[PDB]
Design a protein around this ligand. Structure first.
Ligand SMILES: CC(C)CCC[C@@H](C)[C@H]1CC[C@H]2[C@@H]3CC=C4C[C@@H](O)CC[C@]4(C)[C@H]3CC[C@]12C
Ligand SMILES: CC(C)CCC[C@@H](C)[C@H]1CC[C@H]2[C@@H]3CC=C4C[C@@H](O)CC[C@]4(C)[C@H]3CC[C@]12C
Ligand SMILES: C=CCN1CC[C@]23c4c5ccc(O)c4O[C@H]2C(=O)CC[C@@]3(O)[C@H]1C5
Lengths: 225, 286, 232, 335, 55
């Protein structure tokens, strides 16, 4: 009931099916990491450490695992109408500066960059499209933060910090004040790392967090979870 | 007296919940969910193995009821072949599900490009082929004997009768019981170690609870498999080693052990499928 | 697009010869390929066909099992290995580009050709006429008959018109009974119905001189007409 | 000062519209015969996508369509035989729009890369290759439609539409005036008009030749995600996120009908009309499309069978088929 | 500075004639009544000439 041309059309569609299945099977092994945070938050440092308008793409490999980074710093539009394109993300790399607690934001000269990053983290954790996906929180500019807390206390950000002005407990307090905003802790794990000049530990943290997410996904697949 | 009626009712109730229990898995694996995943394919294969293993229960129950085999030589040949072969397929699919879960948890990078539906398909295909490679010599070896005026068709051997008996019994004991016990315990133990190490299942009360539930289901799987395939195997081994006197307690203990194995084939779906989160989600979605 | 063949010359009868159409200038792996013969004085007859990806291979019944057709997709090369060459193997071969999807235009590019001279239930297509004396400027109808209705149930009538100018390779004019190929002027137009094939050429010029071939593609093997030679 | 002038001008426009409107569509077509229950079945399922589909566009031949998804593939579908004519590997995986040229010669795609790529389907070399990378937008390309074989009108995430010129690679007209991210545009049959709904809950008509905003339509609540002209080009329906599709009017400039139910609360991603215009289909977010009697504001059918959110919905030119893509990698054709 | 441009856009939008919404809805209804027989979805065509068939 088919002509020779229809048979060759069907065979061509079958060959295209085979090629598309191969491409999709290759792409399903990729790890999709969504980059969020301000551009002056060490994003250049983390992309150069991971390698060594629109979306810049970063494909890097680390111990037999393929990664993709979708930086959206150039997408200065309403995030509500395009954030649903990132459902299948292994993790969300969320870079937040530490030395922005006392630096006033340029917009309206009244709001602080640390609290704007806190509101960004609120919008990223509490939106519907990111509920069971982990967030690799990064804290940036540790030595600049050390110098700035030597110069001026953390009470100029907010005086709710009851602790003394030392880096370990001050950074612990800012990490806890950033992490306790998470409304759900049974389903989502936030992996906090203080970025370092060493190029191995920064990508090793991402590798470990992504591997933990892959373990959780394989448990969900096998039905044990 | 009515002691043997207890055995006949025992084979019947096991076939009631073994045939219907595994067929409930088949209806929920196509009409509610699909077989798009490796674990769903493995669950369906295990259900097929269990149903085909429990299909012979009326035949051997009426065999014990009227004391002889009235059906037919090729019919009991395929009955003996099917209930050895499906035991082999069921145990091997439990072993390959254990290796699948271990690869999923302990080696996630390799599990990404190994745990695929096509690979699961070819794994269970070669599993059924390998089990057929030992289920077919039983068909080519079984025959019908007439002893003491009655009919019974346990399989007979070649001229080295004792050597072939010992070789077959040692193979079907050692391989298909020691190897799957060892594999399932080492794989589930390493999986429990890695899930102790993981961050999502430790640190909080709910994470500890999730780890507790997973450890509980793994332990009950291993314990149910061992407590069901230990007594009949040890009984067959000691019967081959030494002669046992024939009595009512001996007969009902043999039938109790075989019914225990068939209860394992009955309770494999309720232990592997109904404790899966996919089947749980399909139940809660309706 | 450029398809150039090699491996010709005189051959001893009963010998062997390797043909190779080194395709270039286009995506070779997505195009099905053919070989189409031509007697030194008569018309065309189809030889063999290999699909894209080597899925389906069809042969002419006169050389089924005598010729082997193969492709080398990384090298963009076609092949036709020939064994036990007979007396009716003295002819010349064309490697034909073709493609098959919806709205495609198969049999639309043809190689320059190579010559191989030896030493000493099919739908038959018959061109009713053989030659027409026509001056440049009037409409000409080329009539080709069919032994079976080429109108398939989908609605396509698989008839393929060719124009072989003297000294060069044939090229497509009408594919599937109504549609003009790329580069063909609008003055060419094929129309008609089942087993009745007329190619009307309004405003004939000096470029229409050549032999016109009707081909079927409804089934296999592919059969050409005798050919109508047009001269001024 | 001048803000009060603009406010009183808008009040004058609203008063003029209320003075012009005297009888709603529901009151004037209450006596028409309803379509009743309408049952459509999935004649074809176009499997083959391995990621979430976003946009599809039909063809003028009414047999070929095209669809884009997140696997970096754009497939032309022979919808009669369920075949794959072509499959384009995109350079940018994130695409929310695809367009089919009315000549059937070119196809288009675009998305978060802010670029309206053009591909040539009828290349002499056989393979489908790039012809023009239409750069010049900074926001995400949400819609693109071929004006003709040489022009294309696009809506983007930088609150500006753009009529392009494919033979030079640069725009000829930029349609500015939205106070919000424009999400979808539809082309009129006469090709000299196009409307575009935006995230400021307003759909603004434009003239293609000059770029003046002829009308604005501020009837919705949340933000427009779907838009489609009537077949005669004198109306257009707008699906937005408040679970309401609103019919509009090019001449009267009021909102004609409202297509909302209390059982449905999520918004509309795509809308299309039938050939008669009496059957407006709206692809909702509740995992199924809806069929609306466009003259009675009733519901006549549900195009179920999708396990995820319906993202695109196209009715073919001869009215035969309705191909509905969704997020479950399938397109289902209804007849 | 954009206030003047917004005011000019509002006034050039305001300067147009609007037809009655009753007449416009009647025209839409008349189009729907005229193109009724050309709609495969509204009136289900028989499966003989329907290009989408089971096989
Ligand atoms: C019944 C006995 C005696 C004969 C042996 C039957 C074997 C060959 C049959 C029985 C169960 C079958 C499998 C059942 C389920 C699936 C999943 C499906 O998506 C692919 C085929 C596959 C993997 C089948 C392959 C063939 C199979 C293994
Ligand atoms: C190993 C643990 C877990 C369970 C032990 C199960 C097996 C080994 C037990 C269960 C019931 C037992 C039988 C109980 C009663 C009799 C009758 C007696 O006159 C001879 C021994 C004989 C026939 C026993 C043999 C061993 C037996 C089959
Ligand atoms: C529960 C039924 C499974 N059967 C498998 C084969 C056999 C069997 C079992 C256990 C151990 C064996 O060595 C063995 O061989 C057979 C035998 O000797 C009689 C009992 C069995 O039919 C039974 C369980």
């Amino acid at each position: 009931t088919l002509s020779a041309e229809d048979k060759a059309a069907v065979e061509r569609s079958k060959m295209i099916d085979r090629n598309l299945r191969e491409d999709g099977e290759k792409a399903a092994r990729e790890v999709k990491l969504l980059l969020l945070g301000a551009g002056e938050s060490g994003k250049s440092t983390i992309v150069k450490q991971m390698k060594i308008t629109g979306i810049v793409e970063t494909h890097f490999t680390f111990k037999d695992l393929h990664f993709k980074m979708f930086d959206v710093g150039g997408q200065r539009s309403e995030r509500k109408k395009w954030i649903h394109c990132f459902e299948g993300v292994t993790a969300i790399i969320f870079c937040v500066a530490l030395s922005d607690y006392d630096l006033v934001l340029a917009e309206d000269e009244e709001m602080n960059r640390m609290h704007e990053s806190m509101k960004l983290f609120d919008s990223i954790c509490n939106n519907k499209w990111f509920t069971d996906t982990s967030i690799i929180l990064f804290l940036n500019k540790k030595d600049l933060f050390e110098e700035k807390i030597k110069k001026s206390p953390l009470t100029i950000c907010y005086p709710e910090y009851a602790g003394s002005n030392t880096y370990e407990e001050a950074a612990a307090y800012i990490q806890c004040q950033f992490e306790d905003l998470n409304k759900r802790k049974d389903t989502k794990e936030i992996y906090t790392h203080f970025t370092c000049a060493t190029d191995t530990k920064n990508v090793q943290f991402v590798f470990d967090a992504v591997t933990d997410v892959i373990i959780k996904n394989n448990l969900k697949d096998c039905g044990l979870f | 007296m009515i002691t043997a009626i207890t055995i006949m009712a025992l084979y019947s109730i096991v076939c009631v919940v073994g045939l219907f229990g595994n067929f409930l898995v088949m209806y929920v694996i196509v009409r509610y969910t699909k077989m798009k995943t490796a674990t769903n394919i493995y669950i369906f294969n295990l259900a097929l193995a269990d149903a085909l293993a429990t299909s012979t229960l009326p035949f051997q129950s009426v065999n014990y009821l009227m004391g002889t085999w009235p059906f037919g030589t090729i019919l009991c040949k395929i009955v003996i072949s099917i209930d050895y072969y499906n035991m082999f397929t069921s145990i091997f699919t439990l072993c390959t599900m254990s290796v699948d879960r271990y690869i999923a948890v302990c080696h996630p990078v390799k599990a990404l490009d190994f745990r695929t539906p096509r690979n699961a398909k070819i794994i269970n295909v070669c599993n059924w082929i390998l089990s057929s490679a030992i289920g077919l010599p039983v068909m080519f070896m079984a025959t019908t004997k007439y002893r003491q005026g009655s009919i019974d068709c346990t399989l007979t051997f070649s001229h080295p009768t004792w050597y072939w008996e010992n070789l077959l019994k040692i193979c079907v004991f050692i391989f298909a019981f020691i190897m799957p016990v060892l594999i399932i315990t080492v794989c589930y133990g390493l999986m429990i170690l890695r899930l102790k190490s993981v961050r999502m299942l430790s640190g909080s009360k709910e994470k500890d609870r999730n780890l507790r539930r997973i450890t509980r289901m793994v332990l009950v799987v291993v314990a149910v498999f061992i407590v069901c395939w230990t007594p009949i195997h040890i009984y067959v081994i000691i019967k081959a080693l030494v002669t046992i006197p024939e009595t009512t307690f001996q007969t009902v203990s043999w039938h109790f052990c075989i019914a225990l194995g068939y209860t394992n084939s009955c309770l494999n779906p309720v232990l592997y499928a109904f404790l899966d989160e996919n089947f749980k989600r399909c139940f809660r979605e309706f | 697009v450029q398809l150039v063949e090699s491996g010709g010359g005189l051959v001893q009868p009963g010998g062997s010869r390797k043909l190779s159409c080194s395709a270039s200038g286009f995506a070779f792996s997505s195009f099905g390929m053919h070989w189409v013969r031509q007697a030194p004085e008569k018309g065309l007859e189809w030889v063999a066909y290999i699909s894209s990806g080597s899925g389906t291979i069809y042969y002419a019944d006169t050389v089924k099992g005598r010729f082997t057709i193969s492709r080398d997709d990384p090298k963009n090369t076609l092949f036709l290995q020939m064994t036990s060459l007979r007396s009716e193997d003295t002819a010349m071969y064309y490697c034909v580009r073709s493609i098959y999807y919806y709205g495609s235009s198969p049999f639309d590019f043809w190689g320059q050709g190579t010559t191989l001279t030896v030493s000493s239930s099919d739908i038959v297509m018959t061109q009713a006429t053989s030659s027409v004396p026509v001056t440049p400027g009037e409409s000409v109808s080329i009539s080709c008959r069919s032994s079976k209705s080429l109108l398939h149930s989908n609605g396509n009538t698989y008839l393929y018109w060719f124009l072989q100018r003297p000294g060069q390779s044939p090229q497509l004019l009408i594919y599937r009974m109504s549609n003009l190929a790329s580069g063909v002027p609008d003055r060419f137009s094929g129309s008609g119905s089942g087993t009745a094939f007329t190619l009307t050429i309004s405003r004939l010029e000096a470029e229409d001189v050549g032999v016109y071939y009707c081909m079927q593609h409804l089934e296999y093997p592919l059969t050409f007409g005798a050919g109508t030679k047009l001269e001024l | 000062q001048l803000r009060q002038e603009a406010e009183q001008l808008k009040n004058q426009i609203r008063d003029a519209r209320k003075a012009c409107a005297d009888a709603t569509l529901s009151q004037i077509t209450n006596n028409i015969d309803p379509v009743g229950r309408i049952q459509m079945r999935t004649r074809r399922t176009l499997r083959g996508h391995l990621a979430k589909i976003y946009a599809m566009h039909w063809g003028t031949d009414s047999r070929l369509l095209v669809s884009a998804s997140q696997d970096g593939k754009l497939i032309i579908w022979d919808s009669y035989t369920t075949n794959k004519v072509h499959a384009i590997p995109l350079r940018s995986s994130w695409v929310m729009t695809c367009a089919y040229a009315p000549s059937g010669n070119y196809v288009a795609c675009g998305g978060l890369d802010n670029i309206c790529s053009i591909y040539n389907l009828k290349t002499r070399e056989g393979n489908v290759r790039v012809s023009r990378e239409l750069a010049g937008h900074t926001g995400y390309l949400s819609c693109c439609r071929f004006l003709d074989d040489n022009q294309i009108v696009t809506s983007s995430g930088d609150t500006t539409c753009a009529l392009w010129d494919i033979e030079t690679g640069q725009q000829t007209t930029t349609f500015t005036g939205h106070t919000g991210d424009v999400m979808s545009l539809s082309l009129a049959p006469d090709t000299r008009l196009f409307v575009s709904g935006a995230c400021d809950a307003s759909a603004k008509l434009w003239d293609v030749r000059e770029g003046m905003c002829r009308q604005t339509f501020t009837g919705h609540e949340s933000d427009i995600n779907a838009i489609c002209f009537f077949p005669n080009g004198n109306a257009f329906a707008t699906g937005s996120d408040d679970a309401t599709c609103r019919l509009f009017d090019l001449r009267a400039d009021q909102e004609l009908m409202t297509y909302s139910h209390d059982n449905i609360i999520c918004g509309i991603t795509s809308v299309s009309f039938s050939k008669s215009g009496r059957l407006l289909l709206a692809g909702y977010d509740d995992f199924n499309c809806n069929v609306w009697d466009a003259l009675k504001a009733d519901r006549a059918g549900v195009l179920a069978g999708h396990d995820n959110r319906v993202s695109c919905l196209g009715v073919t030119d001869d009215g035969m088929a309705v191909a509905t893509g969704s997020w479950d990698s399938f397109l289902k054709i209804w007849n | 500075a954009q206030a003047r441009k917004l005011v000019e856009q509002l006034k050039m939008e305001a300067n147009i004639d609007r037809i009655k919404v009753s007449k416009a809805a009647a025209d839409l209804m008349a189009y729907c009544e005229a193109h009724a027989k050309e709609d495969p979805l509204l009136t289900p065509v028989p499966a003989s000439e329907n290009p989408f068939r089971e096989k």
